[PDB]
Amino acid sequence: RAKVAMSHFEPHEYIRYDLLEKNIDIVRKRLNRPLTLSEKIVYGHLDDPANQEIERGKTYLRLRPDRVAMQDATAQMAMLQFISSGLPKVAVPSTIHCDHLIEAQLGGEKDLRRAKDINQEVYNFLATAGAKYGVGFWRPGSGIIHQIILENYAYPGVLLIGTDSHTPNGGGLGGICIGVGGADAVDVMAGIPWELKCPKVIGVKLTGSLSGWTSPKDVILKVAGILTVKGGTGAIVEYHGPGVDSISCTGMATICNMGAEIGATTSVFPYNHRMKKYLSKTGRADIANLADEFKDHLVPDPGCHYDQVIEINLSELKPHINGPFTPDLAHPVAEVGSVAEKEGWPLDIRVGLIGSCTNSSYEDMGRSAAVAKQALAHGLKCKSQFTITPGSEQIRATIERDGYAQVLRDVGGIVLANACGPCIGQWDRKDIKKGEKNTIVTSYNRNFTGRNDANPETHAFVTSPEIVTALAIAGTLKFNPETDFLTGKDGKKFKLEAPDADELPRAEFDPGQDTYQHPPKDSSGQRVDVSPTSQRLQLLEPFDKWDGKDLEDLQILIKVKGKCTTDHISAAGPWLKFRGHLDNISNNLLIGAINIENRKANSVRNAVTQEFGPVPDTARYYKQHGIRWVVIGDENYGEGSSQEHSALEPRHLGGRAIITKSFARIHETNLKKQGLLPLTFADPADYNKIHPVDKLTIQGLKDFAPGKPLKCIIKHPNGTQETILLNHTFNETQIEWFRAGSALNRMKELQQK
Numbered sequence: 100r101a102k103v104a105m106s107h108f109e110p111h112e113y114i115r116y117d118l119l120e121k122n123i124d125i126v127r128k129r130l131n132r133p134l135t136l137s138e139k140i141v142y143g144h145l146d147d148p149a150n151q152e153i154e155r156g157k158t159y160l161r162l163r164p165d166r167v168a169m170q171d172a173t174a175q176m177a178m179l180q181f182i183s184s185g186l187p188k189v190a191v192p193s194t195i196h197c198d199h200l201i202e203a204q205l206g207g208e209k210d211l212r213r214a215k216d217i218n219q220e221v222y223n224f225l226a227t228a229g230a231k232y233g234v235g236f237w238r239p240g241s242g243i244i245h246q247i248i249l250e251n252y253a254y255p256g257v258l259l260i261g262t263d264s265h266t267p268n269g270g271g272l273g274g275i276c277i278g279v280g281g282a283d284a285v286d287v288m289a290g291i292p293w294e295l296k297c298p299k300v301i302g303v304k305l306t307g308s309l310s311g312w313t314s315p316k317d318v319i320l321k322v323a324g325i326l327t328v329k330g331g332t333g334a335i336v337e338y339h340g341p342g343v344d345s346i347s348c349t350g351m352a353t354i355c356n357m358g359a360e361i362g363a364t365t366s367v368f369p370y371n372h373r374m375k376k377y378l379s380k381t382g383r384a385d386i387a388n389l390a391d392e393f394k395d396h397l398v399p400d401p402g403c404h405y406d407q408v409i410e411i412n413l414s415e416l417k418p419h420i421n422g423p424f425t426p427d428l429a430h431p432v433a434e435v436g437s438v439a440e441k442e443g444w445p446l447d448i449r450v451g452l453i454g455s456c457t458n459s460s461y462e463d464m465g466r467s468a469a470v471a472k473q474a475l476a477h478g479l480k481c482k483s484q485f486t487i488t489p490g491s492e493q494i495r496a497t498i499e500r501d502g503y504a505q506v507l508r509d510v511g512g513i514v515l516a517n518a519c520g521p522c523i524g525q526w527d528r529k530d531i532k533k534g535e536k537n538t539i540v541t542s543y544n545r546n547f548t549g550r551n552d553a554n555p556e557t558h559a560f561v562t563s564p565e566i567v568t569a570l571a572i573a574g575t576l577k578f579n580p581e582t583d584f585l586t587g588k589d590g591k592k593f594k595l596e597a598p599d600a601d602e603l604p605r606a607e608f609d610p611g612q613d614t615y616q617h618p619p620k621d622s623s624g625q626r627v628d629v630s631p632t633s634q635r636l637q638l639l640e641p642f643d644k645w646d647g648k649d650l651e652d653l654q655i656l657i658k659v660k661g662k663c664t665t666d667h668i669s670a671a672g673p674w675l676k677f678r679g680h681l682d683n684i685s686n687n688l689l690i691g692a693i694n695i696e697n698r699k700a701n702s703v704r705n706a707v708t709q710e711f712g713p714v715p716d717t718a719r720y721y722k723q724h725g726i727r728w729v730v731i732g733d734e735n736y737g738e739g740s741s742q743e744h745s746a747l748e749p750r751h752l753g754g755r756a757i758i759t760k761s762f763a764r765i766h767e768t769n770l771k772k773q774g775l776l777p778l779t780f781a782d783p784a785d786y787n788k789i790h791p792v793d794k795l796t797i798q799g800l801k802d803f804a805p806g807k808p809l810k811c812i813i814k815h816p817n818g819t820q821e822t823i824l825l826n827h828t829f830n831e832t833q834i835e836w837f838r839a840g841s842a843l844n845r846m847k848e849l850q851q852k
């Protein structure tokens with residue numbers, strides 16, 4: 100049949116739409132119903148389509164991903180696990196992207212130069228580990244993992260896994276793209292099936308079309324606000340309706356990206372002519388013509404069943420701005436000034452930030468450059484400090500060329516490197532003292548406490564790039580671009596017109612500089628060397644096998660109250676220096692969670708010494724004194740970033756299990772990967788029966804079975820004991836992960852010795 104390749108860097112690796120169509124037909128004959136598109140791509144990729152038991156919300160799917168993509172903050176450890184597996188070459192297409200370790204201070208050239216001095220040990224390690232296991236290396240300066248995947252590797256019907264929670268961006272080009280932790284990526288690179296819990300499916304029906312100030316961003320600001328951060332847990336959001344053609348391929352990618360802030364497994368859009376056009380503009384018109392031929396299998400069946408259906412009329416949608424401490428608190432731009440005032444949100448905006456992978460496209464930058472030029476033409480500049488982060492070299496080279504970059508500098512913006520930077524908090528922020536109370540509006544996705552500048556008093560809002568620009572000219576939340584009047588140099592009160600710009604370059608894309616390095620697959624005789632005195636990289640030492648015993652009299656390290664996001668468990672910013680080193684990064688364990696006893700961060704009672712201390716130190720105390728421990732947590736524990744570190748570091752410091760009312764998807768899978776026991780209250784009111792002082796015995800591990808709950812005895816100080824039941828989502832593939840001590844230890848017992 101056709102021999103069309105996956106990318107311009109893997110020409111011998113062919114797109115298998117012929118497989119997709121065979122597995123779809125087998126599955127559809129067993130189910131006898133319409134399949135949604137996500138169902139066609141996910142079941143179309145099953146390892147065993149004829150025997151795979153399929154229940155939405157219940158079964159685990161043995162799947163076969165087409166490719167793996169890692170960024171450098173989650174990549175080092177993924178490769179440290181791959182090294183430990185013993186295997187010689189990765190088994191599917193795989194890439195590493197250096198975007199995460201590049202700190203914004205001075206602006207792109209210098210910053211990029213500095214970060215290459217500063218992170219030389221890591222980048223070198225990644226490029227050598229790549230050269231060796233046959234993994235593609237995109238160099239520091241290339242771009243952000245999600246912009247490079249959409250411009251180069253995402254296509255209709257790909258199943259892609261990425262070690263990042265914002266991998267769902269790829270659903271803008273019609274594939275199923277799921278964020279995972281470095282251990283799920285090791286399965287796939289090692290050739291062992293990847294298991295996913297069969298998604299439920301939220302249908303969003305889009306109607307009418309966008310105009311003027313309204314953009315893509317607003318559509319998911321609106322959905323985020325309607326579903327709340329836990330509304331899409333265990334579900335894919337499938338967009339459909341006549342309104343989908345009205346949105347560019349770029350914007351469909353924005354909507355899918357931020358579907359991660361409502362915890363969705365991923366998001367997907369149906370292949371359509373705005374994607375055809377994008378594939379052709381980015382050198383892939385052959386994939387586009389091959390996808391016209393399989394179009395049927397790349398769009399939903401007639402009459403397919405959504406578990407939930409939300410209708411969004413695009414034509415009535417208003418600009419929004421979400422926040423400031425969660426992405427699901429939505430306001431129409433029109434009302435946020437009035438609300439800010441009412442709440443003590445600092446109305447004056449200190450920094451406007453535009454870019455990141457959620458919103459640094461050619462169309463996003465043109466829409467921003469078109470608000471910027473109207474200010475300039477009346478002699479203005481930003482009241483607010485203004486930074487621009489292009490999502491790729493290709494976008495920095497083309498907007499530069501088509502003259503957008505210039506306009507953004509003339510209004511006073513600084514063009515940062517094509518790197519995450521301020522989005523992840525790699526930002527040497529100096530315009531505020533720590534704990535100063537300020538506002539910043541971003542075109543980003545996540546705005547949770549102190550994410551961008553580590554200052555917990557920063558009120559960070561997320562809106563769209565053209566809104567960030569218009570409000571950065573105002574320097575106030577008190578400015579609605581639709582109604583209000585600016586004042587030029589000329590003494591004249593003007594209004595700002597709605598931006599219209601080209602979705603794609605008139606000419607084609609200017610690729611920029613040399614940033615890729617393909618694996619020499621001739622040599623591969625690189626020694627990937629880890630200096631044993633390195634503070635950045637350390638080889639993993641395997642975890643203990645399970646002792647065959649019940650986990651008796653466990654100590655509660657912390658009983659967490661409210662929101663305990665991954666970044667509370669393992670913080671980023673300055674800690675990203677240690678993502679290759681398990682011991683020095685363990686020093687950030689749970690320092691950001693609030694303790695229910697005293698309601699502080701990083702202050703828990705040591706049980707022995709009765710002094711209140713830091714959580715890492717206290718867990719290291721219990722480990723050094725043989726005290727096995729547990730974390731009691733509330734709802735949607737582990738929400739956020741996909742980083743497996745939130746699960747390696749508790750296991751490192753003697754953690755045994757984490758009991759919560761609910762878990763976020765990725766985090767729960769990482770805790771199981773690492774031999775820890777993720778569990779949930781059979782009744783969430785039981786959380787109230789546990790106080791910090793009690794000891795807990797998890798009873799029944801010997802006949803740990805799927806669907807069978809576990810017994811937990813609460814041993815109170817006073818000889819009283821309650822038994823509660825704890826549910827778990829294990830299956831027997833995962834119970835062997837527990838028994839072996841971790842997934843990787845299990846994999847190495849399967850390796851014959």
Ligand code: SF4
Pocket residue numbers: 243244245263265455456457518519520522523543544
């Ligand atoms: S830190 Fe921000 S710019 Fe980087 S991949 Fe995540 S969402 Fe995108």
